[PDB]
Design a protein around this ligand. Structure first.
Ligand code: M6O
Ligand code: M6O
Ligand SMILES: CCCCCCCCCCCCCC(=O)O
Ligand SMILES: CCCCCCCCCCCCCC(=O)O
Ligand SMILES: CCCCCCCCCCCCCC(=O)O
Ligand SMILES: CCCCCCCCCCCCCC(=O)O
Ligand SMILES: CCCCCCCCCCCCCC(=O)O
Ligand SMILES: CCCCCCCCCCCCCC(=O)O
Length: 581
């Protein structure tokens, strides 16, 4: 390509080019206002149009990195605003771009983006659509410097669709608020998955990453030969390793190359991928990454005639240990798309341990003969956990399920603070409501994918303020042991009940004023504080106190007196509760 910027403009398109340039300059320049980024985007777009008109212009033949670095260094306020980032302008390429990458401030110091009223949002969307959508996109980009730009563009398109849909109805709030909350949760989950995968590739290792990719791609592509799966795994591992470095252009190029290979080798990968290969380059890899699992062949036999029964198994293992292990992992993942990736990894680790232990001794057939029975409990452990919690979800709604989870996880570990406990338990209740609505053939992957980010958030909260050692021990282990370590937690017999605080168990007239959500937050906080002050409370006593509280607040809001009902009857309720427990 003579002009790389002209190729980018012709492939992506004018609107996509402007959006991506804005997102990139906001991820790099985070303290400049919106108008400066708008002017920079307009100048870059005009230059790209001049390059498209003639490929032999003044500065059209130079690379994208040099043009981007020059546009970054043309900022007159760069030094006085950034300090260190301005020193990268003295470097050459690719040292200058690497220096700019090292200075991407993650989690900067900016005020949080408050959500305005639905009426104000719709009014601003109608009066000026572009300068509103792009303004919010610039804010989100400057607040998330390492977020993948095409994903941010996809989320922005979804937000624009939601705004166009809801602002044209009678009740705009009842339409917009659920969509806004769902989009916020999805964006948080996407960022959490990205950062977690990068941290796992850094800490755990390429071997664990390749095992995870083998399991995933074998579950997604069961009709593929193991050689194709292994090549795809190596390519995807390289792609993720290059994307975790931070260079957006090289990450996009690697993803595009992988998507091109997949769309060219469709005939040897899957059959449910024809739709994604017709989309442009911006959406091709995004569609491929979120494709359904292909149907497996029906004539697939058991894994007994190739891993336990037939001979030459120890020979194939000693000739290539990790190759045979990945072969077994792929052959096991292709059979069970309903299993979680961590479960298949545990099975592979167990098989590896059994082979390593019972191959340096004579007559190894008798050792691994009864080795598939060891897979029975490990498979039944999550299955028994799922179709019991949904059972509880069948007995109690999402709110009561979250309350029961709060009680349980406060009895198990009371050292954790109240707001973090409440947030994690509400997230767990949402996860249960989301994944229990699926049949038993898709519950485990949903639960795994959601519990991953839930426990990740729990531990990024726990690391900044460590309280209990057991919580830090559950995350300092392997990713296949986080959920087992957390489920192995029991009630804390070493915990001492904190002294009674009458100020915490006080309610006022504003409780009836708060919305349907904040009132639940306050009730859950009160429940957590009650469980923490009285941990030895049984189920009957807790249920009785909860019923007394429910009858107390319901007899004060819809009554005659407003203020002299919470401090009057509440003084009796707290004493009645302190009598028991
Ligand atoms: O296996 Al090989 O540590 Mo070839 O060796 O993890 O480090 Mo190539 O990547 O991977 O391209 Mo690396 O160049 O490098 O388990 Mo570890 O069977 O016996 O080795 Mo095995 O010929 O065909 O390491 Mo046979 O390619 O290594 O596995 O023992 O490949 O044999 O394999
Ligand atoms: C529908 C499908 C999706 C379902 C998802 C269900 C729940 C949603 C999952 C995401 C949780 C998450 O991921 N939450 C963060 C995000 O961020 Al944030 O541990 Mo991250 O130490 O900082 O105000 Mo980003 O505080 O202490 O709690 Mo905002 O949490 O509101 O730390 Mo808010 O770097 O930090 O993560 Mo606290 O890992 O970069 O703006 Mo640790 O920071 O948006 O809010 O960014 O990190 C984490 O990405 O806050 C919270
Ligand atoms: C999640 C990343 C979104 C990036 C695109 C933002 C488009 C406009 C969003 C407006 C709403 C922001 C979130 C909210 O306040 O609920
Ligand atoms: C096709 C890739 C072959 C090389 C990678 C093999 C990885 C085998 C891992 C077996 C399970 C160990 C536990 C784990 O990886 O988390
Ligand atoms: C200054 C030039 C800025 C160019 C911005 C280009 C952003 C990358 C677009 C990549 C589109 C495809 C993404 C993918 O395939 O994963
Ligand atoms: C998240 C609230 C509880 C309801 C769902 C419980 C799911 C438990 C099993 C999780 C699936 C993955 C198991 C594993 O990590 O191997
Ligand atoms: C401070 C603790 C907050 C909640 C911690 C939850 C830990 C993960 C739980 C995963 C599901 C376990 C279900 C169960 O306990 O049977
Ligand atoms: C310790 C004396 C006061 C205890 C009051 C109960 C603590 C809050 C429990 C909330 C249960 C009801 C929840 C609801 O229905 O909204």
């Amino acid at each position: 390509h003579k002009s790389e910027v002209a190729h980018r403009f012709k492939d992506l398109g004018e609107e996509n080019f402007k959006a991506l340039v804005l997102i990139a300059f906001a991820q790099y320049l985070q303290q400049c206002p919106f108008e400066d980024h708008v002017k920079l985007v307009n100048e870059v777009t005009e230059f790209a149009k001049t390059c498209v008109a003639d490929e032999s212009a003044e500065n059209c033949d130079k690379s994208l990195h040099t043009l981007f670095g020059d546009k970054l260094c043309t900022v007159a306020t760069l030094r006085e605003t950034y300090g260190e980032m301005a020193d990268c302008c003295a470097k050459q390429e690719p040292e200058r771009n690497e220096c700019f990458l090292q200075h991407k401030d993650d989690n900067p110091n900016l005020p949080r983006l408050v959500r305005p009223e639905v009426d104000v949002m719709c009014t601003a969307f109608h009066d000026n659509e572009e300068t509103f959508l792009k303004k919010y996109l610039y804010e989100i980009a400057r607040r998330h410097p390492y977020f993948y730009a095409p994903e941010l563009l996809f989320f922005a398109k979804r937000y624009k669709a939601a705004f166009t849909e809801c602002c044209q109805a009678a009740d705009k709030a009842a339409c917009l608020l659920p969509k806004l909350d769902e989009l916020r949760d999805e964006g948080k989950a996407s960022s959490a998955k990205q950062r977690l995968k990068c941290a796992s590739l850094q800490k755990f290792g390429e071997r664990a990453f390749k095992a995870w990719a083998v399991a995933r791609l074998s579950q997604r592509f069961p009709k593929a030969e193991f050689a194709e799966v292994s090549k795809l795994v190596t390519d995807l591992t390289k792609v993720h390793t290059e994307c975790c470095h931070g260079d957006l252009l090289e990450c996009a190029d690697d993803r595009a190359d992988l998507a091109k290979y997949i769309c060219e080798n469709q005939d040897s990968i899957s059959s449910k991928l024809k739709e994604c290969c017709e989309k442009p380059l911006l959406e091709k890899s995004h569609c491929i990454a979120e494709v359904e699992n292909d149907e497996m062949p029906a004539d697939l036999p058991s894994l007994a005639a190739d891993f336990v029964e037939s001979k030459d198994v120890c020979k194939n293992y000693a000739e290539a240990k990790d190759v045979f292990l990945g072969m077994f992992l792929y052959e096991y993942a292709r059979r069970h798309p309903d299993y979680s990736v961590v479960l298949l990894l545990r099975l592979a680790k167990t098989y590896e341990t059994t082979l390593e232990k019972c191959c340096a001794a004579a007559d190894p057939h008798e050792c691994y003969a009864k080795v598939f029975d060891e897979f029975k409990p490990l498979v039944e452990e999550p299955q028994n956990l799922i179709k019991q919690n949904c059972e509880l979800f069948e007995q109690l709604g999402e709110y009561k399920f979250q309350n029961a989870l709060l009680v349980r996880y406060t009895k198990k570990v009371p050292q954790v603070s109240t707001p973090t406990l409440v947030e994690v338990s509400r997230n767990l209740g949402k996860v249960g409501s989301k994944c229990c609505k699926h049949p038993e053939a898709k519950r485990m992957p949903c639960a795994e994918d959601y519990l991953s980010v839930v426990l990740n958030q729990l531990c990024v909260l726990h690391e900044k303020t460590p309280v209990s050692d057991r919580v830090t021990k559950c995350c300092t282990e392997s990713l296949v042991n986080r959920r087992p370590c957390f489920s192995a937690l029991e009630v804390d017999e070493t915990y001492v009940p904190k002294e009674f605080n009458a100020e915490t168990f006080t309610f006022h007239a504003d409780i009836c004023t708060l919305s349907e959500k904040e009132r639940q937050i306050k009730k859950q906080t009160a429940l957590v504080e009650l469980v923490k002050h009285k941990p030895k409370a049984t189920k009957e006593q807790l249920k009785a106190v909860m019923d007394d509280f429910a009858a107390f607040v319901e007899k004060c809001c819809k009554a005659d007196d407003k203020e002299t009902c919470f401090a009057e009857e509440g003084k009796k309720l707290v004493a009645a509760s302190q009598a028991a427990l």
